[PDB]
Design a protein around this ligand. Structure first.
Ligand SMILES: Nc1ncnc2c1ncn2[C@@H]1O[C@H](COP(=O)(O)OP(=O)(O)OP(O)(O)=S)[C@@H](O)[C@H]1O
Ligand SMILES: Nc1ncnc2c1ncn2[C@@H]1O[C@H](COP(=O)(O)OP(=O)(O)OP(O)(O)=S)[C@@H](O)[C@H]1O
Ligand SMILES: Nc1ncnc2c1ncn2[C@@H]1O[C@H](COP(=O)(O)OP(=O)(O)OP(O)(O)=S)[C@@H](O)[C@H]1O
Ligand SMILES: [Mg+2]
Ligand SMILES: [Mg+2]
Ligand SMILES: [Mg+2]
Lengths: 325, 261, 319, 386, 258, 261
DNA sequence: GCAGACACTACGAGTACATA
DNA sequence: TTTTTTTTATGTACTCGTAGTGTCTGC
């Protein structure tokens, strides 16, 4: 049947084989499940890489639908996870048996970086004393916000960013399930603008399919509003090759016609700077000035003056690069 | 269209008062047989099975089956201002989100229409095994409320044992131990106060006192309680309402470990 | 029955099975053999064996009387101000018949979580009932335990386990489990352990379950290289104003999925104990804090970290 | 029962002649407790900081034949013998020690009931019964209302007839401000290393253990003149496997090292003055100043002391660049505090521990500076509120 | 092996309520003559000397001499669940860490076995308190608890003055002055209400009101109470029980006389 | 010079806490007919009229028309020090700035006197129009306090509908709609429960919950309460208190939504 | 049958701190 | 050889005092 769902939730890897990237980690967790030797897991990485979906597929593989409510205790940041919850419901779930069928239980603590340090210190002996009865899975995006005791007690798997070569078949599966007309440059634009994020890949795909009806490079870069790489090359050429007035006029006309934002222009110019064989002092000056301009855009500032400063940071270094020779 | 009419208002108060700090939200399953409720607690340790029969209500009609998950703290505030000698009507439509509660005042002069917004939790059905038990004990509910209250003063976990002789309550605490052994109290004038042993195999298990004390707040529902115990299946605290249905309380045993020495 | 993981399955049950900190563990063996152990506080890094040493000492001292003469309290318990007054003091007053040289042991594991008032109420019950009861404390940050409690105990400090000390226990686990291995795979397990026996056992079990063999490629396919081991040379390149190699290390750490907060935390951790000039270190730390305020304010991109690296390179060239 | 007791309990003093504290403090406490013999035992005959205490012992008595200071307040670092001195002096003067410590309830009702039981009644034994001397340990951790109850029963004119001894570890607690103006303040100096070394030598000779005076002096300077910590360290280090204690076992950081809570003035002296002449490396002083300023606590008071004391030094920087970069560091600390208290991101508080080591690097001198307590910012805030 | 079967649980409930907040421990010295409890306060204000004889129990077995240090808040939790008319079995072994109490309190054949962990304490030894009392009077127990409750409403301390006419109870405060004039009440039908006079050298002392209210918590324990007091010697009230034994309470006077 | 004497201590001990969290000051206006009090809330919503006639006092002296202003932050804490069944009197000199009240201490033995400074505030009488309201109804006193407490658990604003059948209290919230309909309680033994409708024109106005809860804190003073509603005149909560006078409340209606078709 | 006393839990209030 | 005080905006955690209230005792 059809459901009114976002494509990040309509297409979720309910089984472990539907995930794409981390094949060694998923194979090791599958061999943990098959041997019934599942340890305390610590899944960390950037968002959108498949940490929640992995443990949900593992929980559905370990437990049946008639025993899932008494075997899995899933708590996240939307629930209260204070120290009275660690001493209360979590300890009573860990220290007791099951109801229907005998087996080890699972405590899923999603977004474990948001927990307080008192709760994390109270979690240590609950994990250690009841290893035979229950298992604890900790999910976080920041490993520095989890205490080193819980990092020692749980074996850590890094769910790194998804490579664009592996995000193509899952996007093709979503495309062929949703009847989406997409070209090759549309797929390249999706996997370039995602930057190791499967969630925003499906979000950009759904928004581009609804906005235009076809997914090409121009439709993706128009719906997202991201500048094209030819536009960034033209901006760099104007900033490095002519005077202040003509570069200001050309960059202002390009930003007015294309409807560009200075944040993405700064990001792509920062990526272009390290590719250009600059002198070291010129590179340091450009990085400091671009970081200052990027910091200035986080408040109620005028974007035209910051665009002029972005032009100025290269108009200063024109003479230094040329006189370096 | 679902329309259930409580003949008495005290039973709905006494059911909800037992489940107030235990059941997170009420899952009323409605069919032609009656009203069912199988919901776990917040800690996923206890399970509450409530079955209200259709013949217990004053008027009961049900066209299509419904599963109306609703909040219980919201249901607690509308049941405090409810009389104990008046009829309460449960109403809900086919494709609506309002659960209507119509009753009378303690002054018995005004209608009181209390709507509740239904919840959309997707809860999987828990499979009750319905197997036999190695111990079945009939017991007064007033005595079982007293003993679990008396052993909460000593410790926090009770090692309740049963055998052919009777049920035994033990609580090893900080002060010491409290051992209660009651057996064969059927030689009295009343009929509710009696200890009857049905099954054979002895079983010793340890349970939390916090959940057992929550189970004993259903004491005004039934004057006699039934305790079921076995070595694998959990402890069942079966209340049977006189003309309305029955209530079952499940509690998992705690993990205990022997000393290596 | 469900088999325990190798962290808990191969927990030592005697004090002679504990590797690392040989003098302190040997003195604990002598004190378990003879008796009359004083109050102790064992401090150190996680996974060193403090709780294992305390529990093995309590098991060797008490034995069959471990159930009635030992009180183990964790951070998962309450242990507030009213537990020290009404449960610890009552257990210290409790009469337990024990052999000569043996006392009741009140194990207060992870004593960092205990409040200041509870530790103030813990002093006189430590001092009065010491003829019949004893205290065994374990902690990570020993400064959180107050000075009067540390004066009332023999403060033991555990250091990080070396490569050979972890390697001996790993060889014992391998010979117990018949794990095929190579030398460089065990060196990779030691390198990923970083002085932690728990992480060594977890990485060994993960590599054995996932691949069935211990070489360097199977270890590094599921485990990871430690973070500050490359941040150290990133800071070294920032000292010599080498912005290109520092950005290469920064981009390599960025493409592995590390958040900017973790990267700048490792940068501050390296710069706190780096070997350079003191004034240069102070202005480096001030620049790190200035960038960390921007990261916590909401702006956190690769351009901000590159600007931080460029500012750290400038601070060298601006005497 | 040599194998049943701790070595601190086995070698604890039971007489007046075997106390290890400073003799001036013991004599002052004994003379203060013997001024109560007029109103308690009914007998006319009992048988700088020093000048004020000698004046307090010879200033006479109030018209109700009692001393004008009815509370003896004992303050100092731990492990010196304050509780031992109080109990030995109370048992020496014929009193019965009534102990009130921090493991009691310390609520004002229970505090009032305990003091009214200890001080307002006679003995059950009648004639020949020992009088009750109330010893209140850990009075620094008591709440302010308990101190108000103690002062109310102190100055009630239900008249007080029995002495009260109060023992604290920090005299500058906010709850003991009005108690200091009314009590017989006995500040405990650190114990003499020669007497402590002789006592540790006697303890080791009683246990059949051999140790040089040098290694015992190393232990005494390691434990910061703590009697209890030194005896516990000897009890752990000796055991029975070996007899002769080595210098390297004491010099090792594995046994006997405890985290000292440094005072504010010691931290300010350690920051503003270089150590006198290895330890001459700048990185060792950097890490020592950082760890000591972290171990002190009360970081805002340290920052206020640095702000109020760095301009009164004999500064060699006549170009005011060091003052400018110190004020930049202070503004950096202020911005860190504001950003951590604004965005709920408290991982920005690991940097302001480097403010005292920045002040140590900038203003290191070999002179002897006069450090005063910071008062300008608090007086400015009080005047602004007024 | 020690066993002591108390014939009724009223004996034990009313004793442990009379000294619940009065003393913090119970030291039951066990001999062949009976059960002795001699406890003093830490601040040396009140003394409880309880003596229960072996003839007042249902059974009494005592092989070795025993000292059972017991917490009073721990054993006050037992009697709260005990019956007022019930046989209580107080038993312990010779060298044991535990003390057991067995009873059938609710009269519903509910065999309750309550055990407590003993506490080891330092042995404070006082041989015999001297009894050379000049003023010994007799008084009903109900009226003595009546006037201690009446005097507690006004002041915080009472002045007790023996005389040839009787005992005088007075207090002073900001509220008022509560005073009674006890006369000879021997012309009544009840033999317990009569005030017997066997005194000489009338004295006057000041006592705390709070500790006297704790002493008068044993009003249903005995029919009458014997008050003994003199100069420089603490006041003794005496509750002579019918068959088990006797119970006395010592109270040190305040330092500020009158 | 002003001197008045009450007849009971509970006529001022139960009315002052209703004005404790409602209004910030109690302005007493002294006249020969009686003592008047018209104070308005700081939010310009609530308005309380309290007039006590001179015949109900034990004694009353008034030569000049004087007005005194005192604050609720100081008169509330001395009210709990005063007794319940003791006598209360109020004294005020002509030229002094001190208001002195003499009553009996709760031990019933000594005279307790408290002094309060007179706050000089320049206020003016707003003036009620005393127009004929579109609704007049009579409700019980203790039942009406139970009405606004029940709608306090539902939403922050209640809806009052008074047609010819009765008075409907409604509150639509995030839990569900709570509707009651008090009507036709004339067949009761006690005369204070006679629910009756005295007008014909219906009206529907929404009011704030918080001030109506403040209005129900003066409920044990009288046996009944009179409610008056109109199209634009504020709601009147009228209490006929004992014998010495009557109490009057005013409450501005809430805004209405742009529900035009 | 109704007034007084006992402890019971829920709730209001004050305070500290949050890094390595 | 030198010590007083309240500001940062939330969130959590701890601790302590207070007030309706269910239940027991008694005339
Ligand atoms: N490896 C993957 N394979 C396939 N789809 C994926 C993968 N990772 C993410 N997705 C898609 O993205 C959605 C969200 O994935 P999540 O598991 O929630 O990512 P996540 O790792 O949990 O990120 P955070 O840290 O929780 S915000 C899924 O429902 C899928 O549609
Ligand atoms: N020195 C050691 N020798 C042998 N095994 C060890 C050692 N240290 C740790 N282990 C193993 O690691 C497990 C955990 O050790 P623990 O003592 O519990 O850690 P810990 O020292 O308490 O550190 P924290 O601060 O509590 S995380 C043990 O069960 C052993 O399997
Ligand atoms: N002359 C002595 N010889 C040997 N041991 C001693 C001597 N004097 C004291 N001690 C012991 O050293 C310790 C002194 O500490 P205490 O007097 O009990 O407490 P304190 O010194 O006031 O320090 P704090 O603040 O309470 S930790 C005790 O364990 C004494 O038994
Ligand atoms: Mg997630
Ligand atoms: Mg541990
Ligand atoms: Mg001390």
């Amino acid at each position: 049947k059809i459901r009114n769902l976002p494509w990040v939730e309509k297409y979720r890897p309910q089984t472990l084989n539907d995930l794409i990237s981390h094949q060694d980690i998923l194979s090791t967790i599958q061999k943990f499940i098959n041997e019934d030797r599942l340890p305390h897991l610590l899944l960390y990485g950037p968002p959108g890489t498949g940490k929640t979906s992995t443990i949900l597929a593992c929980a559905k593989q370990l437990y049946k639908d008639k025993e899932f409510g008494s075997m899995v205790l899933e708590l996240n940041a939307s629930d209260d996870r204070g120290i009275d919850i660690i001493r209360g419901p979590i300890l009573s779930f860990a220290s007791t048996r099951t109801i229907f069928k005998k087996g080890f239980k699972l405590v899923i603590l999603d977004e474990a970086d948001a927990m307080t340090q008192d709760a994390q210190n109270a979690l240590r002996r609950v994990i250690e004393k009841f290893t035979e009865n229950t298992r604890f899975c900790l999910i976080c995006n920041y490993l520095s916000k989890i205490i080193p005791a819980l990092q020692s007690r749980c074996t850590r798997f890094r769910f790194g960013p998804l490579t664009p070569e592996l995000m193509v078949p899952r996007l093709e599966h979503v495309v062929e399930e949703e009847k989406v007309d997409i070209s090759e440059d549309g797929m390249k634009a999706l996997v370039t603008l995602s930057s190791g994020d499967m969630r925003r890949a499906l979000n950009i795909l759904q928004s581009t399919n609804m906005a235009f009806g076809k997914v090409t490079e121009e439709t993706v870069y128009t719906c997202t509003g991201h500048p094209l790489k030819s536009d960034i090359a033209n901006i760099l050429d104007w900033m490095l090759n002519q005077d202040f007035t003509t570069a200001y006029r050309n960059i202002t006309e390009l930003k007015t016609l294309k409807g560009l934002a200075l944040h993405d222009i700064l990001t792509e110019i920062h990526l272009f700077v390290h590719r250009v064989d600059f002198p070291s002092s010129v590179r340091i000056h450009l990085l400091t000035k671009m970081a200052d301009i990027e910091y200035r855009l986080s408040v109620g500032t005028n974007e035209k003056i910051q665009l002029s400063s972005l032009i100025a940071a290269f108009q200063v270094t024109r003479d230094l690069i040329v006189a370096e020779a | 269209m679902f329309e259930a009419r409580l003949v008495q208002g005290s039973i709905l108060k006494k059911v909800l008062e037992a489940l107030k700090d235990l059941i997170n939200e009420a899952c009323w399953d409605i069919s032609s047989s009656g009203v069912n409720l199988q919901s776990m607690d917040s800690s996923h340790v206890s399970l509450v099975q409530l079955t209200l029969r259709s013949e217990g209500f004053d008027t009961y009609r049900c066209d299509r089956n419904l599963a109306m998950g609703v909040n219980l703290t919201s249901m607690s505030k509308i049941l405090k201002c409810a009389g104990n000698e008046d009829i309460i009507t449960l109403r809900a439509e086919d494709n609506a989100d309002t659960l209507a509660l119509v009753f009378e005042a303690p002054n018995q002069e005004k209608v009181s229409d209390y709507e509740m917004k239904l919840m959309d939790l997707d809860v999987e059905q828990l499979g009750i095994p319905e197997q036999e038990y190695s111990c079945v004990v009939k017991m007064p509910s007033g005595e079982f409320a007293r003993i679990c209250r008396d052993l909460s003063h000593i410790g926090d976990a009770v090692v309740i044992s049963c055998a052919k002789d009777g049920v035994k309550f033990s609580a090893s605490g900080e002060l010491g131990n409290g051992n209660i052994k009651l057996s064969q109290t059927s030689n009295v004038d009343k009929e509710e106060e009696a200890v009857t042993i049905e099954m054979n195999e002895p079983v010793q298990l340890t349970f939390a006192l916090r959940y057992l004390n929550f189970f004993t707040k259903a004491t005004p529902l039934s004057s006699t309680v039934t305790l079921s115990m076995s070595a694998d299946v959990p402890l069942v605290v079966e209340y049977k309402i006189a003309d309305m249905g029955h209530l079952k309380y499940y509690l998992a045993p705690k993990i205990e470990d022997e000393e290596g020495s | 029955h469900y088999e325990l993981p190798w962290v808990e399955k191969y927990r030592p049950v005697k004090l002679n099975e504990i590797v690392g900190n040989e003098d302190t563990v040997s003195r604990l063996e002598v004190f378990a053999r003879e008796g009359n152990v004083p109050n102790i506080i064992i401090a150190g890094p996680p996974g060193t064996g403090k709780t294992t040493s305390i529990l093995c000492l309590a098991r060797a001292l008490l034995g069959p009387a471990l159930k009635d003469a030992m009180l183990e309290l964790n951070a998962s318990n309450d242990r507030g101000i009213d537990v020290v007054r009404n449960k610890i003091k009552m257990f210290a007053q409790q009469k337990v018949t024990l052999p000569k040289g043996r006392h009741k042991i009140i194990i207060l594991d992870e004593a960092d979580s205990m409040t200041d008032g509870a530790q103030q109420a813990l002093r006189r019950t430590m001092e009065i009932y010491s003829k019949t009861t004893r205290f065994a404390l374990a902690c990570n940050a020993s400064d959180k335990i107050i000075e009067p409690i540390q004066s009332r105990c023999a403060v033991l400090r555990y250091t990080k386990l070396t490569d050979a000390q972890i390697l001996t226990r790993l060889m014992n686990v391998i010979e117990k489990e018949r794990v095929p291995y190579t030398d460089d795979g065990l060196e990779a397990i030691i390198f990923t352990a970083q002085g932690d026996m728990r992480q060594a056992l977890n990485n060994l079990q993960s590599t054995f379950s996932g691949f069935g063999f211990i070489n360097s490629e199977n270890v590094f396919k599921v485990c990871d290289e430690p973070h500050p081991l490359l941040v150290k040379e990133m800071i070294q390149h920032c000292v010599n104003a080498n912005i290109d190699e520092a950005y290469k290390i920064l981009a390599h750490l960025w493409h592995l999925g590390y958040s900017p907060e973790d990267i700048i935390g490792n940068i501050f951790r390296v710069c706190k104990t780096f070997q350079m000039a003191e004034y240069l270190k102070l202005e480096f730390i001030k620049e790190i804090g200035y960038t960390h305020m921007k990261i916590a304010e909401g702006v956190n991109s690769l351009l901000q970290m590159a600007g931080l690296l460029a500012r750290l390179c400038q601070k060298t060239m601006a005497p | 029962a040599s194998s049943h007791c701790l070595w601190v309990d086995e070698f604890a003093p039971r007489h007046y002649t075997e106390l290890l504290s400073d003799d001036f403090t013991n004599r002052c406490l004994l003379k203060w407790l013997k001024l109560w013999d007029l109103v308690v035992f009914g007998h006319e005959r009992p048988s700088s900081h020093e000048q004020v205490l000698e004046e307090m012992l010879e200033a006479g008595l109030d018209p109700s034949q009692r001393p004008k200071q009815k509370v003896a307040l004992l303050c100092g670092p731990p492990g010196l013998g304050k509780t031992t001195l109080a109990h030995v002096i109370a048992r020496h003067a014929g009193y019965s020690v009534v102990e009130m410590n921090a493991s009691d309830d310390r609520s004002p009702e229970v505090f009032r009931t305990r003091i009214e039981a200890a001080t307002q009644m006679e003995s059950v034994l009648g004639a020949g019964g020992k009088p009750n001397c109330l010893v209140i340990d850990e009075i620094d951790g008591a709440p302010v209302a308990a101190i108000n109850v103690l002062l109310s029963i102190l100055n009630r004119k239900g008249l007080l007839m029995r002495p009260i001894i109060c023992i604290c570890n920090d005299q500058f607690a906010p709850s003991l401000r009005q108690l200091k103006q009314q009590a017989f303040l006995l500040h405990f100096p650190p114990t003499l290393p020669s007497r402590l070394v002789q006592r540790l030598q006697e303890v080791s000779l009683r246990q059949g253990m051999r140790a040089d005076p040098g290694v015992l002096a190393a232990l005494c300077e390691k434990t910061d003149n703590d009697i209890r910590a030194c005896i516990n360290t000897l009890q752990f280090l000796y055991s029975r496997g070996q007899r002769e204690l080595s210098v390297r076992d004491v010099q090792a950081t594995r046994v006997g090292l405890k985290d000292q809570r440094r005072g504010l003035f010691s931290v300010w002296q350690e920051v503003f003055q270089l150590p006198r002449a290895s330890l001459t490396s700048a990185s060792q002083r950097f890490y020592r100043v950082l760890h000591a300023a972290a171990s002190a606590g009360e970081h805002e008071k340290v920052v206020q002391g640095l702000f109020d004391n760095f301009l009164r030094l004999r500064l060699r920087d006549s170009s005011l660049g060091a003052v400018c970069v110190a004020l930049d560091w202070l503004a950096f600390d202020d911005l860190l505090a504001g950003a951590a208290h604004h965005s709920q991101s408290f991982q920005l508080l690991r940097y302001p521990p480097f403010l005292p080591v920045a002040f140590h690097v900038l203003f290191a001198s070999s002179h002897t500076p006069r450090i005063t307590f910071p008062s300008s910012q608090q007086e400015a805030q009080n005047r602004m509120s007024q």
